[PDB]
Amino acid sequence: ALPSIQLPVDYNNLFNEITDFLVTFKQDGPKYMAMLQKVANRELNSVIIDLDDILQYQNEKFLQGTQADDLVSAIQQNANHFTELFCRAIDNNMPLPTKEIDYKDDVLDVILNQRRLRNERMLSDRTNELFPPNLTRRYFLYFKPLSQNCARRYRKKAISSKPLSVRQIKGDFLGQLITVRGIITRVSDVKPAVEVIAYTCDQCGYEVFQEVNSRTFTPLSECTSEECSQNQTKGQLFMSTRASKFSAFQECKIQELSQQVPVGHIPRSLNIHVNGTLVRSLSPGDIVDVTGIFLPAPYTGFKALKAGLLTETYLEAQFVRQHKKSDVEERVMELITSGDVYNRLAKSIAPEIYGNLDVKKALLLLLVGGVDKRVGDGMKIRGDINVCLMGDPGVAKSQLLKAICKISPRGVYTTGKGSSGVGLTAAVMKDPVTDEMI
Amino acid sequence: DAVFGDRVRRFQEFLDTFTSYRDSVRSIQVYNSNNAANYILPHRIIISLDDLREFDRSFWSGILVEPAYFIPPAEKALTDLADSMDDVPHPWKLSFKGSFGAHALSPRTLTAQHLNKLVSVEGIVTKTSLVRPKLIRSVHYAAKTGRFHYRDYTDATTTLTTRIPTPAIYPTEDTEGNKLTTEYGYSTFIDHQRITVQEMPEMAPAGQLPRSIDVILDDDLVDKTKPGDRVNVVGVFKSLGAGGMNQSNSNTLIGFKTLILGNTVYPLHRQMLTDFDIRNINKLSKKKDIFDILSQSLAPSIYGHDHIKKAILLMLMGGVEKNLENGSHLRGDINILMVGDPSTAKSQLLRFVLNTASLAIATTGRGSSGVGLTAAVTTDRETGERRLEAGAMVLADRGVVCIDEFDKMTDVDRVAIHEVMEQQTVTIAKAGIHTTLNARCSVIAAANPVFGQYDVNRDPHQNIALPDSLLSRFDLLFVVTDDINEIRDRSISEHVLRTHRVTIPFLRKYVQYAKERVIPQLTQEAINVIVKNYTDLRNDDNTKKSPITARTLETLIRLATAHAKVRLSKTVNKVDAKVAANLLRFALL
DNA sequence: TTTTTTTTTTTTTT
Ligand SMILES: Nc1ncnc2c1ncn2[C@@H]1O[C@H](COP(=O)(O)OP(=O)(O)NP(=O)(O)O)[C@@H](O)[C@H]1O
């Protein structure tokens, strides 16, 4: 019944290494001692733990002995447990006071304050097994990748590292923290999810905390509390939505680069979850180096349908690196003193296309447009320059527009089909997937 | 299962005797660690079955016959052996070859006896049920009691042998009740797939239609093969599933849908040039009339039209490519169209571009939905996932699309056809997934005169049959007259009569090589001429006919570049441009 | 002990 076999991997000492990893360090006082505080100080939420300093810290833990067991490779080979352990010890050395906490001020801050004060005080009357550590956090943990120029220490192969295609993505990559690159598509809107989630009880009260594990769970009422229980008959209990905590969740698919792919083989988009402070980080149609923990989430179901179990998996967000993110009037002041603002900047329009600066000349009128006017009643007199092109076939006039919207403020580059009637007139185009009728 | 070990110690003798397999065995065992010295190898081995009759025929036959009783211990034997190999610093797999067989058969037929036996079965790949990774081994970590805990899950599709319904739940707090966390990044997941194969349509016996059957692809076999490819697929044909008799449902005759597990999946018709061959490729490459030569051999029956032939080979190279940095590409592949009175051999001419060309797929008019457009397989198929599937033009990526009656295609298709050529991609909004996927393709078609034989009499305007931007993207429009010369007609007759009554295969072996080695880039010598030529066109070709654009000049680039690959010159040269100046004259006159 | 499904093809129609 469930055979069990030893392996070189042991969490026991690694925990200790994590304690010495945080709050004890120099090269980057250290970053792990007072920034952790600044989280407990409530000026910051995201805990950014770099694979960089895991490497440099193993430079402190090896070279520079005494030698220590593997980290970044053990990390990216598992990727999930290291947020449940490396982060769990953070509770121990976190600064107490910390500074200027107040209470309310913040809503629910007094709730949890008086949660554990009414908890300990109602536990003080009974004494005259505790709210889980994940309940009080208010900080997310984000690992970031090591490319790296200092990964060249080197551990060589162990670096991924590479932003491989989803075609390159494999089944052995389950439970592996990796880099992936690709376009954002459909980017589900941010929604709360859940975390513990304390449901109150009716007669003698108390409380119980149902862990939030997986994607779904069974709700429960009965009575757990010994006093409402068995007398009489059972204390009723309901969920308290202000006793709940919600981790931030926005799931977004990321499509393949399309040049990563073999010539046939339609693009394969992959499923990703967002958690935490990194919410809102990703917007539609955006290429990014996205690193994250990739885990199976079966099933619901179906079930006996699948078989084999055929996981279907998903990705969770960890880190985001996005490609391509007065003294400004002074930056303008070589142009102000340049003279010939109108003809010169008219030459500056689409410098690629040769000839017909007479056309660019009017395009210049467009980029600025203006000024409108308001008649005082009022009804606007444009104010807006509607100028059209002509002649054919190619001319690469498309380039004139192509650069114009690329540069001109709030531009829309369109065509006949192209932007439709409903591509121009707000209607009720049923929303695909996430619903509905947006 | 003492006999299970008997198959192994029988085959154990086969280990190291003969040892000719251990070379590649060791090789895997080395190149893996050589990638481990870097700064990827599959675990499985091709075994020519041919050798095994030289040890045990008594073992031989059953390998095909009852592989469930034979292949898993020899499977174990590969692993056993390789494990006995160095060094300390996985279940593996097999393929074989054939050397067949009974068991030689095509997918058109199968069962009864053919079931439960190793078989090689070949053909068209469709529709490509798309990839999802699959669960196999479970693992968990107890605390504080620690240790390491695990399960092993087995689907009916895994291995061969029937086994108890393992699925499907995590062991989850095995006694004593200690918490057990999933080991992710530990426990095993092999990817799985099910890929049907349609028998070749042309080898179909009668009016009866093509029948595909599925074959499961585990581990490596996935992503090896796209739809539409000719593939010999070998493996063991499983009897799978309940007979409807598992339950009261359903009371009926029907049942036992079945497929083939494993094994090899070879593509067929790349290629293999050795040395002695490519030495001929280059020996011929030295000769300066070879362009015309290669052109003539294209159409064994067909009369002349050598300018069209040349044009075709010019499309057969691909004419390189150049991708801008941080900007849109300059299309290098060549798109042409044929037009003329019926019996020009235009369709039949397309059928030559059917075989030598190394893909792509040809179509008669219709066509659609959106051709290469996926048209959004709906809904799902399967497990709640809406899916796309390879369309014609997509399947044709980096290959030859050909069209019978491009004039007879819908006006609605034409939209995406513009999208096929300039934009050179595929935009999909339909349900749906918004992917823009590369449509880059070499495309040639044929259109008949809109009205009768007036192709020659009427102006090109109204003779187009497919205006307008469609005309721009075309590198060449070829008017071919059915016009009569009795002088010519004698010639027309005799070769046509000796019909029913310089080598092409090598031409494919050469073209393929000229693609990857090498791209010519450019020299200014072509440039110092074709410019003069283009302006010469604009100041002249408008005193004759139309059209003229910058694009038609960009074809001078592509044309010259095509012949540049034909010379196998490391660079573009002036005389190649002279080949272009040749081709466009006859293009418009 | 039950699970869960709207495009694409063709059609007849003002
Ligand atoms: N050298 C040749 N030149 C022309 N036709 C040939 C030649 N050799 C054979 N043929 C025959 O000529 C016919 C060509 O028909 P073809 O024009 O290719 O089909 P099609 O164009 O689709 N019919 P249509 O659409 O009306 O033009 C076939 O029957 C060929 O076998």
mmCIF file of C-alpha atoms and ligand atoms in Angstrom, chain B residues 301-305 340-349 404-405 446 448-449 492 496 499, ligand 1:
data_model
loop_
_atom_site.group_PDB
_atom_site.id
_atom_site.type_symbol
_atom_site.label_atom_id
_atom_site.label_comp_id
_atom_site.label_asym_id
_atom_site.label_seq_id
_atom_site.Cartn_x
_atom_site.Cartn_y
_atom_site.Cartn_z
ATOM 1 C CA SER B 301 5.325 14.715 -72.378
ATOM 2 C CA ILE B 302 4.659 18.451 -72.546
ATOM 3 C CA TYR B 303 5.811 20.620 -75.456
ATOM 4 C CA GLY B 304 8.190 23.448 -74.709
ATOM 5 C CA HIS B 305 6.734 26.224 -72.567
ATOM 6 C CA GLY B 340 -5.271 30.180 -71.351
ATOM 7 C CA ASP B 341 -7.669 28.155 -73.481
ATOM 8 C CA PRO B 342 -8.603 24.658 -72.287
ATOM 9 C CA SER B 343 -6.209 21.837 -73.122
ATOM 10 C CA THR B 344 -3.159 23.957 -72.329
ATOM 11 C CA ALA B 345 -2.028 21.103 -70.051
ATOM 12 C CA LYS B 346 -2.352 23.606 -67.210
ATOM 13 C CA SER B 347 -3.979 21.200 -64.709
ATOM 14 C CA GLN B 348 -1.837 18.279 -65.801
ATOM 15 C CA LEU B 349 1.144 20.640 -65.575
ATOM 16 C CA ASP B 404 -7.268 24.292 -60.573
ATOM 17 C CA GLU B 405 -9.734 27.064 -61.407
ATOM 18 C CA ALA B 446 -4.333 28.353 -63.261
ATOM 19 C CA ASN B 448 -9.261 29.821 -67.797
ATOM 20 C CA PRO B 449 -10.371 32.713 -70.020
ATOM 21 C CA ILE B 492 2.060 18.532 -81.647
ATOM 22 C CA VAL B 496 1.639 13.136 -78.310
ATOM 23 C CA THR B 499 3.460 9.548 -75.628
HETATM 24 N N1 LIG D 1 2.128 18.980 -74.213
HETATM 25 C C1 LIG D 1 0.824 19.139 -73.961
HETATM 26 N N2 LIG D 1 0.259 20.350 -74.147
HETATM 27 C C2 LIG D 1 -1.036 20.506 -73.900
HETATM 28 N N3 LIG D 1 -1.919 19.610 -73.483
HETATM 29 C C3 LIG D 1 -1.346 18.413 -73.299
HETATM 30 C C4 LIG D 1 -0.016 18.102 -73.512
HETATM 31 N N4 LIG D 1 0.232 16.761 -73.222
HETATM 32 C C5 LIG D 1 -0.953 16.304 -72.846
HETATM 33 N N5 LIG D 1 -1.952 17.245 -72.861
HETATM 34 C C6 LIG D 1 -3.340 17.015 -72.504
HETATM 35 O O1 LIG D 1 -4.063 18.222 -72.634
HETATM 36 C C7 LIG D 1 -5.095 18.293 -71.605
HETATM 37 C C8 LIG D 1 -4.864 19.523 -70.774
HETATM 38 O O2 LIG D 1 -6.030 19.925 -70.035
HETATM 39 P P1 LIG D 1 -5.871 21.076 -68.956
HETATM 40 O O3 LIG D 1 -6.048 22.458 -69.595
HETATM 41 O O4 LIG D 1 -4.577 20.935 -68.250
HETATM 42 O O5 LIG D 1 -7.069 20.829 -67.955
HETATM 43 P P2 LIG D 1 -7.999 22.023 -67.608
HETATM 44 O O6 LIG D 1 -7.317 23.299 -67.939
HETATM 45 O O7 LIG D 1 -8.383 21.977 -66.097
HETATM 46 N N6 LIG D 1 -9.380 22.038 -68.550
HETATM 47 P P3 LIG D 1 -9.794 23.678 -68.625
HETATM 48 O O8 LIG D 1 -10.109 24.167 -67.161
HETATM 49 O O9 LIG D 1 -11.004 23.864 -69.474
HETATM 50 O O10 LIG D 1 -8.611 24.583 -69.167
HETATM 51 C C9 LIG D 1 -5.014 16.971 -70.845
HETATM 52 O O11 LIG D 1 -5.947 16.040 -71.358
HETATM 53 C C10 LIG D 1 -3.561 16.537 -71.078
HETATM 54 O O12 LIG D 1 -3.408 15.125 -70.981
#
